[PDB]
Every structure is written in C-alpha cells, then in structure tokens.
Structure 1
Amino acid sequence: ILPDSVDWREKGCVTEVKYQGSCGASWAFSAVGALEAQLKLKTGKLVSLSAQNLVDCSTEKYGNKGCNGGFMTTAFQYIIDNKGIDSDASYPYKAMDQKCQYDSKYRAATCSKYTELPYGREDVLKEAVANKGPVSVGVDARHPSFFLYRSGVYYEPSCTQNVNHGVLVVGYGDLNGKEYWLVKNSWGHNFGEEGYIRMARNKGNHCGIASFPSYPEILQ
C-alpha cells in the first residue's frame, strides 16, 4: 500500500543542508527542517527557518538549553506559543547562545500543532513520512563510523536505541538490496552524501531512528 520510496527533497520541500558547528543545536535544525516542509506544502514557498530563533528563544520554559541540547517537540511548542518563527535570513545562525531577538516583522512561518510517533515503530514512521512529510527524529550518533560516514546505507553494529543527535527523515527507500531512511544532517555539505546519511531501515530501530519521531503541521 505505501510507496516503495519517498524523497521530500525531490518534491522541493527541503532547504539547503546546514552546518551547526560546535553548538549542539541539532534539535533546532531538525525542528525547523520539519516545519520548512509543511510551510512549502501550505504556501508553495520554500524558505529556511531560523534555528537561531529556537536556540535563543525556546529555552528553559521548553526544557531546552541552547547550544547544550534541546527537544524538537518543545521547539515546535515554542513556535506554537510564540505564534511564529523568523526566517533564517532575518535571524541567521551564529552557533552561540544569544539573547532572544525574535521579531514578528520577519515571521516566516507559524505552527499549529505537532504529533509524536510511537517508540520504535518503523512501520508507523514509514507511514508518516509517506503521508505527512519529513519527520524530526533523534539518532545515536556517538560512533566514529557516524562521524566518518561518506556514502551508502549506514549500519553500525554497536548502535543503541538511545538517541543524542537531532536529524530529519526526509524519505526512505530500498537500494542495492538495503532498505534505508533518507536522513538530512546538519554537519554541512561535506558530511556523507552531500549532507545526507542513508540509515539502515527495518533493522530493529537501528541507532534509535524511530525512538522519538515527531512532525509539525500548519493548519488553514
């Protein structure tokens, strides 16, 4: 019933790969990346949203700690509560904790709601990627093989289901006998496959990719 593969980048719903640097803001990149796709779907415009806005403004009230880590779910809740998030162009990324400088004059998106998917359910994750759009997830990236990944379907025997790095599932497929998740990272274009990593799919929640999925929506 579900398509064999989906790629939301091919549907024009994914912005350029970003570079987080030495600031632990992968949660903020994962969240804006999911919302960017919903924004494209609803308005026809593809616009990078401000991860720095989340770093500086979605802070202790949201359980988040800026460059020391955060949640995608509470990032979405900030955008709901704030009734907007600035464009990345107006509020660019500095890889530092800064004062909140959100300005509604440069609001580029809103968020109406978000959804959390059940733990470890790669079938439900697949359905959501097919039927909803890119999904924010955490993965276990504390392995040299992850940092050193260049191409192919990533499979790390010592991976755990305990996540520590936010990323964005923008698709999935089946290539060269291997089912995979298509994952947008925030380590710049020189990481992996032009900034992407394809991660083993249907291998018992490999690297925790389906541990904590969430996605936002923008309602009419």
Structure 2
Amino acid sequence: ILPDSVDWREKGCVTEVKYQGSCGASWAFSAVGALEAQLKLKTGKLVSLSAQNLVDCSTEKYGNKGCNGGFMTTAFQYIIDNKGIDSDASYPYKAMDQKCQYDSKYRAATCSKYTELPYGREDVLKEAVANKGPVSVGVDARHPSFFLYRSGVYYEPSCTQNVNHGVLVVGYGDLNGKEYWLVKNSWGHNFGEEGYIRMARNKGNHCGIASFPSYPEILQ
C-alpha cells in the first residue's frame, strides 16, 4: 500500500540545508524543517522558518535550553501557544542564545497540532513520512563515524537507541539492497551527501531514528 521510496525534496517541500555551528540547535532545525514542508503543502510557498526564534523563545516553559539542547515536541507547542513563528529571513540564525525577539508582523507560519509516533516503530514512521510529510526525529549521533560520514547507507554497530541530535526524515528508499531513511541534517552542505545522511532502515531502530518521531500540521 505504501511507496517503496519517497523523497520530499522532489516536491519542493524541503528548504536548503542549514549550518548549526557551535550552538546545539539541532532540535530547532528539526522542528522548523518539519513545519516548512507542511507550509509548502498548504500554501504552495517554500520559506525557511526561524530556528533562532525557537532557540530564543521556546525556553524554560518548554523545557528547552536553546544552544544547550531542547525538544521538537515542545517547540511545536511553542509555535502553537505563540500563535505563529517568524521567517528565517526576518529572524536569522545567529548560533547563540539571545533574548526572544519574535515579532508577529513577520510571522511566516502557524501550527495547529503535532503528533508523536510510537517508540521504535519504523513501520509506523515509514507511513507518516509517506502520508504526512517529513518527520522530526532524534538520532544517536555520538560516534566518530557520524561526523566522518561521506556517502552510502550509514550503519554503526555501536549505535544506541538513545537519541541526542535533532534531524529530519525527508524520505526513505533502497540503495542496492540496503534500505535507508533519507535524513536532512543541520551541518551545512559539506556534510555527507550534500548535507544529507542516508541511515539504515528496518535494522532494529538503528541509531534510535524511530525512538522519538513527531510531525506538526497546519490545518485549514
């Protein structure tokens, strides 16, 4: 019933790859990237949403610590509570913790709700990515092989199911027998495959890719 491959870049639903730098804002980029695609599906415009906005404004009330980490679920909740989020163009990413400078005048997107998927269920994640859009997930990126990844289907034997780095699953496929998830990262274009990492799929929640998935929606 589901397609064998999906790639949301092919439907103009993914913005350019971003660069987080010294700031641990991966959670924030994961969140906006998920919302960006929902905005494209609804409005037909692809605009990069402000990760910085999340870092500066979705703080203690959402259990997040800006550059010292956070959560995509709580970020989606901030966007709901805030009744908006600014464009990246208006609230650019400065890779450090700042005061909250959200202005409703430059609101580029809204958020109605978000869904959390069951832990470790790669079948359920496969469906969400096909039926709903790119899904915010965490991975275990705490290995040298992650940093050193250049291409191919990434597989790390030491990889736990405990997540620590925010990424975005923009599709899935099969590279000569090896099933993978197509993962947008936030380390610039010089990381992996033009900023993307294809990661092992259906290998026992490898690197905890399906440990904490979630995606937002912008309802009519």
Per the normalisation by structure 2, the TM-score is 1.00
Any unmatched runs of 5+ in structure 2?
none
The alpha carbon displacement at 1:89 in A equals 0.1
The alpha carbon displacement at 1:10 in A equals 0.8
Q: How does 1:44-63 map to 2 (within 5 A)?
A: 44-63=44-63
The alpha carbon displacement at 1:129 in A equals 0.3
The alpha carbon displacement at 1:117 in A equals 0.1
Any unmatched runs of 5+ in structure 1?
none
User: SS of 2:67's equivalent?
Assistant: helix
CA offsets 1:83-129 (integer angstroms, 9 cap, x no match):
00000000000000000000000000000000000000000000000
CA offsets 1:157-177 (integer angstroms, 9 cap, x no match):
000000000000000001111
Distance 2:146 2:34 in 1: 22
CA offsets 1:162-207 (integer angstroms, 9 cap, x no match):
0000000000001111000000000000000000000000000000
User: SS of 2:77's equivalent?
Assistant: helix
Distance 2:60 2:191 in 1: 31
Aligned length: 220
Distance 1:9 1:124 in 2: 21
Q: Are positions 1:117 and 2:117 aligned together?
A: yes
Distance 1:19 1:176 in 2: 30
User: SS of 2:130's equivalent?
Assistant: helix
Alignment RMSD: 0.3
Distance 2:176 2:154 in 1: 13
The alpha carbon displacement at 1:56 in A equals 0.1
Distance 1:17 1:9 in 2: 11
Distance 1:10 1:21 in 2: 27
The alpha carbon displacement at 1:65 in A equals 0.2
Distance 2:189 2:175 in 1: 22
CA offsets 1:18-52 (integer angstroms, 9 cap, x no match):
00000000000000000000000000000000000
The equivalent residue for 1:196 is 196
User: SS of 1:34's equivalent?
Assistant: helix
Distance 1:216 1:172 in 2: 19
Distance 2:188 2:85 in 1: 22
Tell me which stretches of 4 or more aligned residues in structure 1 moved more than 6 Å: none
Distance 2:143 2:176 in 1: 24
The alpha carbon displacement at 1:76 in A equals 0.1
Q: How does 1:100-115 map to 2 (within 5 A)?
A: 100-115=100-115
The equivalent residue for 1:216 is 216
User: SS of 2:11's equivalent?
Assistant: coil
Distance 1:192 1:70 in 2: 24
Distance 2:190 2:139 in 1: 19
Distance 1:73 1:11 in 2: 25
